[PDB]
Design an enzyme around this catalytic site. Sequence first.
Site, PDB file in Angstrom:
ATOM      1  N   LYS B 154      16.638   0.130 -65.069  1.00  0.00           N
ATOM      2  CA  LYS B 154      17.507  -0.372 -64.010  1.00  0.00           C
ATOM      3  C   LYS B 154      16.933  -0.057 -62.639  1.00  0.00           C
ATOM      4  O   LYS B 154      16.785  -0.947 -61.794  1.00  0.00           O
ATOM      5  CB  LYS B 154      18.900   0.237 -64.136  1.00  0.00           C
ATOM      6  CG  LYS B 154      19.658  -0.153 -65.369  1.00  0.00           C
ATOM      7  CD  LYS B 154      21.120   0.184 -65.214  1.00  0.00           C
ATOM      8  CE  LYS B 154      21.345   1.671 -65.082  1.00  0.00           C
ATOM      9  NZ  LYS B 154      20.732   2.438 -66.189  1.00  0.00           N
ATOM     10  N   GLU B 180      23.807   8.458 -57.608  1.00  0.00           N
ATOM     11  CA  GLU B 180      22.518   8.477 -58.282  1.00  0.00           C
ATOM     12  C   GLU B 180      21.725   9.696 -57.828  1.00  0.00           C
ATOM     13  O   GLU B 180      22.071  10.361 -56.852  1.00  0.00           O
ATOM     14  CB  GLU B 180      21.731   7.189 -58.011  1.00  0.00           C
ATOM     15  CG  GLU B 180      21.335   6.987 -56.555  1.00  0.00           C
ATOM     16  CD  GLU B 180      20.211   5.990 -56.389  1.00  0.00           C
ATOM     17  OE1 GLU B 180      19.866   5.313 -57.376  1.00  0.00           O
ATOM     18  OE2 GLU B 180      19.668   5.888 -55.270  1.00  0.00           O
ATOM     19  N   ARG B 181      20.643   9.979 -58.546  1.00  0.00           N
ATOM     20  CA  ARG B 181      19.857  11.173 -58.273  1.00  0.00           C
ATOM     21  C   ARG B 181      19.346  11.164 -56.838  1.00  0.00           C
ATOM     22  O   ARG B 181      18.892  10.139 -56.331  1.00  0.00           O
ATOM     23  CB  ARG B 181      18.682  11.259 -59.244  1.00  0.00           C
ATOM     24  CG  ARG B 181      19.060  11.134 -60.711  1.00  0.00           C
ATOM     25  CD  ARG B 181      17.824  11.046 -61.574  1.00  0.00           C
ATOM     26  NE  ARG B 181      18.132  10.793 -62.973  1.00  0.00           N
ATOM     27  CZ  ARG B 181      18.571   9.634 -63.442  1.00  0.00           C
ATOM     28  NH1 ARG B 181      18.761   8.613 -62.622  1.00  0.00           N
ATOM     29  NH2 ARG B 181      18.819   9.492 -64.733  1.00  0.00           N
TER      30      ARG B 181
HETATM   31  N1  LIG Z   1       8.331  -1.776 -65.542  1.00  0.00           N
HETATM   32  C1  LIG Z   1       8.144  -0.653 -66.266  1.00  0.00           C
HETATM   33  N2  LIG Z   1       6.979  -0.410 -66.894  1.00  0.00           N
HETATM   34  C2  LIG Z   1       6.774   0.703 -67.622  1.00  0.00           C
HETATM   35  N3  LIG Z   1       7.704   1.658 -67.778  1.00  0.00           N
HETATM   36  C3  LIG Z   1       8.920   1.542 -67.204  1.00  0.00           C
HETATM   37  C4  LIG Z   1       9.210   0.355 -66.397  1.00  0.00           C
HETATM   38  N4  LIG Z   1      10.463   0.492 -65.949  1.00  0.00           N
HETATM   39  C5  LIG Z   1      10.943   1.665 -66.423  1.00  0.00           C
HETATM   40  N5  LIG Z   1      10.019   2.291 -67.166  1.00  0.00           N
HETATM   41  C6  LIG Z   1      10.217   3.592 -67.840  1.00  0.00           C
HETATM   42  O1  LIG Z   1      11.547   4.033 -67.594  1.00  0.00           O
HETATM   43  C7  LIG Z   1      11.556   5.240 -66.840  1.00  0.00           C
HETATM   44  C8  LIG Z   1      12.380   5.038 -65.585  1.00  0.00           C
HETATM   45  O2  LIG Z   1      13.623   4.464 -65.940  1.00  0.00           O
HETATM   46  P1  LIG Z   1      14.691   4.140 -64.800  1.00  0.00           P
HETATM   47  O3  LIG Z   1      14.746   2.653 -64.634  1.00  0.00           O
HETATM   48  O4  LIG Z   1      14.415   5.019 -63.614  1.00  0.00           O
HETATM   49  O5  LIG Z   1      16.037   4.641 -65.513  1.00  0.00           O
HETATM   50  P2  LIG Z   1      17.439   3.885 -65.366  1.00  0.00           P
HETATM   51  O6  LIG Z   1      17.080   2.441 -65.573  1.00  0.00           O
HETATM   52  O7  LIG Z   1      18.247   4.476 -66.482  1.00  0.00           O
HETATM   53  O8  LIG Z   1      17.931   4.229 -63.987  1.00  0.00           O
HETATM   54  C9  LIG Z   1      10.129   5.597 -66.492  1.00  0.00           C
HETATM   55  O9  LIG Z   1       9.839   6.939 -66.875  1.00  0.00           O
HETATM   56  C10 LIG Z   1       9.273   4.626 -67.267  1.00  0.00           C
HETATM   57  O10 LIG Z   1       8.592   5.295 -68.331  1.00  0.00           O
HETATM   58 MG   LIG Z   2      18.603   5.072 -62.096  1.00  0.00          MG
END
Ligand SMILES: Nc1ncnc2c1ncn2[C@@H]1O[C@H](COP(=O)(O)OP(=O)(O)O)[C@@H](O)[C@H]1O
Ligand SMILES: [Mg+2]
EC number: 7.1.2.2
Lengths: 47, 469, 508, 188
Positions: B154, B180-181
């Site tokens: 996300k 959020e963080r």
């Molecule tokens: N486009 C991408 N390519 C590779 N890995 C990704 C990508 N998007 C997210 N990730 C993986 O997801 C993690 C980050 O997720 P994040 O989107 O920050 O969490 P959330 O969606 O729950 O807020 C990263 O550590 C990475 O490994």
């Molecule tokens: Mg997030």
Amino acid sequence: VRSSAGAVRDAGGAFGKREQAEEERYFRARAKEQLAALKKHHENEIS
Amino acid sequence: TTGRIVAVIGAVVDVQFDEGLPPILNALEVQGRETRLVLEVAQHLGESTVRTIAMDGTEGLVRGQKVLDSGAPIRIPVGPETLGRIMNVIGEPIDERGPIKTKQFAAIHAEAPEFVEMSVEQEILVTGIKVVDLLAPYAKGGKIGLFGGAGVGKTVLIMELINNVAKAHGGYSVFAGVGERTREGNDLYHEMIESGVINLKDATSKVALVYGQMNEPPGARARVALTGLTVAEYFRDQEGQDVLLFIDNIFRFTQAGSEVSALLGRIPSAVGYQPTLATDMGTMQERITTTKKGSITSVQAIYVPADDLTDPAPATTFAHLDATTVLSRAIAELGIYPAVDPLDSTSRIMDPNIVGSEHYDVARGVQKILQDYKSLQDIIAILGMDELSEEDKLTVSRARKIQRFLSQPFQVAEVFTGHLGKLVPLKETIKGFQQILAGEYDHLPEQAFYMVGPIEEAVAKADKLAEEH
Amino acid sequence: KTGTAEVSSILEERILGADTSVDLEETGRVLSIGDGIARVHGLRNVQAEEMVEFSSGLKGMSLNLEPDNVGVVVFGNDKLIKEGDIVKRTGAIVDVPVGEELLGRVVDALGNAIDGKGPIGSKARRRVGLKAPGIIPRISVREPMQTGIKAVDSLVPIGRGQRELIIGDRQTGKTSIAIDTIINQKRFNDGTDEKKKLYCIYVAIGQKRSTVAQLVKRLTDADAMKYTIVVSATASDAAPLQYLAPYSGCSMGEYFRDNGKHALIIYDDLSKQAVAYRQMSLLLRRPPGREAYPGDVFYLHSRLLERAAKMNDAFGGGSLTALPVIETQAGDVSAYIPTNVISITDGQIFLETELFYKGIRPAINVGLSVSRVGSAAQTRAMKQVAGTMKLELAQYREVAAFAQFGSDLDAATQQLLSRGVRLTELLKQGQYSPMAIEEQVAVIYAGVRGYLDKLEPSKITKFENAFLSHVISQHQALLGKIRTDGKISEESDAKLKEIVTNFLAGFE
Amino acid sequence: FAKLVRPPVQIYGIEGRYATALYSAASKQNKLEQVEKELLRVGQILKEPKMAASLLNPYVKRSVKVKSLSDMTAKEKFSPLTSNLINLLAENGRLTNTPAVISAFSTMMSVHRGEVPCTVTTASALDEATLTELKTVLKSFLSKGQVLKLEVKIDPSIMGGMIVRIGEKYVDMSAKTKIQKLSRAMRE
Ligand SMILES: Nc1ncnc2c1ncn2[C@@H]1O[C@H](COP(=O)(O)OP(=O)(O)O)[C@@H](O)[C@H]1O
Ligand SMILES: [Mg+2]
Ligand SMILES: Nc1ncnc2c1ncn2[C@@H]1O[C@H](COP(=O)(O)OP(=O)(O)OP(=O)(O)O)[C@@H](O)[C@H]1O
Ligand SMILES: [Mg+2]
């Protein structure tokens, strides 16, 4: 309570991993064959 | 008017007024605090008492502390001077750069636009992401959702959208971090400073930031969304211009509302949510709209507690969005990133009369082939790939090629993958998928299509794979 | 124990004899206000569900009459209401305007125009809480309510005076079913047959305003507003308005039913009226039940849906079809509100996403769909073709598992699979492109007599298209005969045979 | 609503609300002393065994109770404030906690006339001279016009010294706490 398509791999039990591997091995083999053919075509079409 | 704290329970403060009561939603200022603590009135309990939710920590409050009544809801500074800054729920700056010097203060509570103000025009907004553009195309002025649990992409996806649309977007832009963080807030601040949307020297900033992270008491998380929404609303109206509004996540608004309901005397509903979940979410999501006076393109990240799309919060949020892109963990495990689920994503403009018959037919062909693939996966679990009809193997091969080809490398996910970001124009995505379906590539191996921009890059990657075979 | 009117202000008033200058019969003073619920002191002569009016120009409905106080639900934001306000009786239970002056107008839950086209005509008013008819005024459902959708009209017939139920998941096509039903009635309303005209009401509970605006644009495009009312109770509306909007729509339709005309009301969506009522009940401290819903929620929906009747000729003969829409979650039709409304209504059009993405749009899942009225709500020609179509589809659904295998099976199952695939490809339909009944019967007749067993399935959706145009242009006499007559006469059957063979004899 | 005048000490509960209503009613018009005297009177009037037995039975209708209380109030010539208060307590059925109201108002009236209840605890009794200097110093603690209400309990559980409460202020010069403090100092 019903059942839907693509549920065996939604559970992720043993059948799910078994099916995933059965698919991956086959398509790895076919990718190898297609890559060999692609190399052969490359060489044969260089000229 | 002047009142007097009479109870403090968690984040809920009961304040007694000897003169006239303040109306619901008014902001009250606690007298005797080193910082600024603002309570917001939420109920009249009779006997001159009013219950309130504190927009800050209620530590060190004393039964009897005097309270002032501002006479108006929380009024935040609005205008072109907020651009490049950061703000609280109550509008004071938290970027350590001095006061925000505006002439206009806007109250964060307002009525939603009336029905005689709705724009009914839709036109695709090309984001440069293959899956989004093909299967769930966005729309200018429409509200976008980004559902998905934790760790699916996300934040990365929304950062990628800010990188694309916002950077090359003439109008302004607002980012509301809701619960959020704080690490991510700092990272975004610095990434924008580096990119240039936030300019600390001149007055050319194009982004206004509002933050109420997850260290804040529920009162502040439940209202920072309204603060960001107020900034966006002002830029929509007075400035009379296009706006983008990114929110991350809009599930923390609901959750923060749920952390105080039980203390306000409401019986819980459903799975321990406040009884006013749908109304509270509607009175907010109904001000994020493209009236005839302006145009807000709203992108919302929506946490789905435990991947459960039937939870009351995401389930209710579904009805307030034009486009949705349900990121899926089962696809992120496979390494397909962004993990957008092609069958659980939808858009309103996805009709043959808005996008075109070629785009629509390509999208529907892709969705149908993926659904057929899902149907076949059940059989392959018992037979095996070796026993499929020589036509079914063709469906499986096309489906896997299409599954990989939807993956794409972002310019913000360089750190993870190490690859380089690609932006794929819409025509190139349509051509790529139409060709993959038509069979013009049933000899290249699957892995050639994994994490590449246009289709020609897949051909080049296959050539490299064959040469180093 | 304790009461809410025992606050020291009321006791202070009563101790020093200041309770005689206040008229505690037709006026009251707000004791509490919060989360849209006001607790008022006084109003001793206020009736249950009567509308009171606050000093600040707001309205409210007095729901909970307790010994100490009255629990009023406010029709708007409780920002303007403060403890100590003055609340005056209106004297009358809530009612809404009715008549042909609403057609083509978007109104809110209380009959106020919100489209800015001027005041609402309104000659007559009607109470939203009126008991439905009885065992006697009604008569059996007989006339059909042409949905214009091949699946719904062929395998899930809907009569007039019936309560169907478009139950499905999120983004499957429920509002599309409703809008196609609304748009298909133009061919009858434009005409002159006064017993086929259907007036449409679209209750939009809990949808955002953009959705309703786009929907109104869609209806206007199809020139289907001149006989449509739209009653909006969008998300920003207070919970009482979302609660009432179905009843306002039902009364605006009961007007047409009583006055001999025919109406169709689409409560979309009822699962949101249930949520609004749940909020109101929980904030009034009423005892919760399963899933936090009050005890009388089945009552809430039954007293609404049982007003869809088919009056008999001694009362006018009018009718009010109801098409409540309910959004199930995963696929759980055993949840609380889905269960209630499945046990209340007379059928169900059950939509899928598996079918939606497999290409079978509209995703009407036959087998789980049902219509306990059935053939009684079909024309003779549609009966003739749909009996065979339904039988063949039922045969096809129990051997559909073999579809992937197919080959290496007997000839009977080969034929069953082939015919079933052709029929399913026939039931596919576009969007906002309803079909007259003659067109539907022609297409299904071609399909179910084997005249497509040679065409490849991928071509059927083209055949169906081109073929239809042919008959709609070259052969109008036969279509008119089938339409007006209502049945397929032997001569008309022969003409259809010749037409289908001649067109199919040269297609490619 | 009518801006009631708040009492000095806030009593809470059912008795608190009734007593605050009575205090606000009396403070305007000014009848606090007379109404307090009448409250003390009704403290005994209702306590009569016949009346108490006839008012603690919930099977005599509220009508009969209100009529009997009206007769008693008329037979005693009260202020309309006290008569209305008794009527109100009778209608609401709050007679079983009537004394708690009279008690509350007492606590609410004592503070009105300026009083800070005090407590002194010692191992053994005191000689009147020392009690006199205690009076003097404690009156030093108070403010202006705030009469004192001394209470001298005797607690032998403590081993000596003194313990003094003035309102919420507390000073503990008892041998027991010093023994405890020194002992705990040892063990650390
Ligand atoms: N486009 C991408 N390519 C590779 N890995 C990704 C990508 N998007 C997210 N990730 C993986 O997801 C993690 C980050 O997720 P994040 O989107 O920050 O969490 P959330 O969606 O729950 O807020 C990263 O550590 C990475 O490994
Ligand atoms: Mg997030
Ligand atoms: N028969 C059909 N053919 C093609 N597209 C369709 C068909 N039926 C529905 N759709 C499309 O599917 C999408 C979702 O349909 P629709 O919104 O009517 O379903 P819904 O269940 O009402 O959605 P929601 O319940 O979330 O409002 C729409 O964009 C619509 O255009
Ligand atoms: Mg819908």
